[PDB]
Design a protein around this ligand. Structure first.
Ligand code: MG
Ligand code: MG
Ligand code: MG
Ligand code: MG
Ligand code: MG
Ligand code: MG
Ligand code: MG
Ligand code: MG
Ligand code: MG
Ligand code: MG
Lengths: 175, 175, 175, 175, 175, 175
């Protein structure tokens, strides 16, 4: 029936973790839609495809880590529906590549906002282990990832459409 | 914005592949709910949890392989919603372990049924490349997986609840 | 009682596989009779003996693979009687060696005809996995084996009886 | 067309060796039916299946060794029909595993009885080479195999049906 | 003078294979004309030259594989004329590189159409071995090749004429 | 768009190189027809097949070297049609092997005559680099190949038909 491990773990904290699992899965799914777009033969931006596919795997790993954490604390994992992401990332004015990177950046900042919410739930329930788990396993990697993608945005704006985007994509491919 | 690779690839086949991606993703998600249940401290069947987690990873890799195939043929990948799986796999008369394994078996047979439909879609559109992709990459591995899981069901019925289930789980844990 | 794996597997397909198991065993047994003849001290064609003994092992391995396949699909293996092969392969006009190779060739073509029958049973029962299993695991190796033995027939006809047969046998021995 | 090697080798002994080849082949075939039964998905005793498959291979290698011996002595090898073995080894009161092992034990004792007759055939024809071939290559290995299988029968009676049988099977699987 | 191997091999299948051999040779020859053009000192696109030269060698290897297959099945190889390809691939609007890569794409799709025709001939003559040979040895490699070249077309359109084309060519050279 | 490398390179020399490219391709094609004949299951001369296959590859490599040379000198490669070779090489009185080796000898001496023509075109046009290219890259290998094949003709005449030809062929196979 009941968890024998659960201790100092509030219903609201359990719920916030189940919510964060769903955020990470949904963002993982959008990254996989981004991979599927740039992997098309008529788009053919293989570095962007690779980067978005690796980002999809990374976010799913975050989701799996939170599932494991939930059970460590004795909460119960509830897996919520995963929403259908858009399929098309065409943007004639910005170029598809810059538009996709700007969307990835907004994806990372949304994830960060959600993580900061989990942290506030932990603090208001006096759960220092949950607060530390979020800080040490997610918050620092999240701001590093935000800065990295913001740098890609800046570089894609600098090189311009056409040859420059293709070249930035080759740099992404071989990193 | 049109595929330059696409040839002899019907919209019928394109949609069946997008449906199969969704089937594999949903089955992967159910396997992750099964992992999350047996990973609970009060269930504590580590072999079952490991088997279902690795099954979840395998089904996700099937989805990603079909995504890449779609783009090879010049179809457009559409990622459909992933439905929320059940969280509870308690069953007093069968025991949780036998019940979960019988559910895994029906998951694999449902996947096989969907795969056989994709193959008939290929045949009816005279798409021998798609037919052979399904046969060579999925259909043989699928009947092997169904037999493996039916063997686990038989072994779980033989050893009985309690000590026997825990012992079967340890064997799974070390496979 | 009943197979839990069996799915899309017709009674006629199960029967055709049990029949093919018996074909492979019977051909394996005739190859072993061929080995036993050329291994006689007064025949003393050690390359032919070796080739026929390895062919006997190969065909028995085919029989064992079909037994395993039957259980993978959830059919029930029925092992039918194995017929007594002839013991003597003397042929004064052709020479024993050429006569035995021509018989091996007819053995391989009979096996091929039986395999093509299994395949037709699979197609008429809409069993694409069985059809692919036969194609990918048997049909290609079978035509390669038929061409190889036909080449031995042609070479044995070319070298002629006596010294030439003994020499061709030495070539077979060291391959 | 006559053997130049044959010496002190009675037709009595030649026929007894051809009979022993047939005994080993029939026992090998029964062991393969036992493999095919325990390899079923609803039986799923992998250790038993492996033991019986390796027993089938061992008995076939005995047949092939006797074929080679026949030709060493200058007898003519005759390969007799191999009879269809039973397919079903279900036994509610003993349990399938104990029943099958007791059948294996009687198979080995029947083989031993046949071997002892071949030895008496050698003795009554003053064929000390044949007698010593039987003693050195078969009779000691045969009593060792009978004792090993009688030990398996005793262990299967001790552990009882259900969990115990599955556990004994796992020990067999890792031997 | 007659094939002893030939079995279940229709005259129409033999002809379709001989036609496919000629298609592979003609495509190989056109690739060699593309190599000879981009290897000119005043064109000097080394990566495209290398790619077209390796494509010519691989298409010739396909022709040789089909020759060997014809003899495995016991048909007779007939080698037909290889027609003269164009020598000039100058295109002012598209640029030579994009024009040549679009031409390569249509050559691969033309080969694919002929392969699918051979497949249909095999199906119509109930030749599952020939159907499987085309599927497993040619059709999958062909769709991968078509996607690769369509990706090259997309990249050549993205980078534009002049510096971009030269840069894409360097990428192709070192891959 | 004109060659910037071309220097002291006469139109007649350019044309003689394009003619020689077509000579090597046609000879290569005939060697492939010889391979396809001796690769038949009812001919089964594996050494002759291997020799003619590698001769075909060698002559095609000569053609490609002449293509590269043409571009080094600034001429334009023109690829002419490749005529259809014979498919049958049966000769009852000589035997197929001796007849085919005598045909290869004629092929090599014809190629030699064409090369000596290219050399005389170079001399008439005071093109010492072309003359030296032909001398050092082709003429010496050509007389060595001619002597090699003449030696094969003499050995095939000496061993006679049947066992001798098969034996010579085995020697060729292991060279
Ligand atoms: Mg994350
Ligand atoms: Mg801290
Ligand atoms: Mg799957
Ligand atoms: Mg076989
Ligand atoms: Mg296939
Ligand atoms: Mg024995
Ligand atoms: Mg080439
Ligand atoms: Mg090709
Ligand atoms: Mg040459
Ligand atoms: Mg010189």
């Amino acid at each position: 029936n009941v968890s024998l491990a659960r201790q100092n773990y509030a219903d609201d904290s359990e719920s916030a973790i189940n919510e964060q699992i769903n955020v990470e899965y949904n963002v993982s799914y959008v990254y996989h839609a981004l991979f599927a777009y740039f992997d098309r033969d008529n788009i053919a931006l293989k570095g962007l495809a690779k980067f978005f596919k690796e980002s999809s795997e990374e976010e799913r790993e975050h989701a799996e880590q939170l599932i494991k954490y939930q059970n460590i604390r004795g909460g119960r994992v509830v897996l919520h529906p995963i929403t259908s992401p858009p399929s098309e990332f065409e943007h004639s004015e910005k170029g598809d590549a810059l538009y996709a990177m700007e969307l990835a950046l907004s994806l990372e900042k949304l994830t960060n906002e959600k993580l900061l919410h989990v942290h506030s739930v932990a603090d208001r329930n006096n759960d220092p282990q949950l607060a530390d788990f979020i800080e040490s396993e997610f918050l620092y990697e999240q701001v590093k990832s935000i800065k990295k993608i913001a740098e890609y945005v800046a570089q894609l704006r600098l090189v311009g459409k056409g040859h420059g985007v293709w070249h930035f994509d080759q740099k992404l491919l071989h990193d």
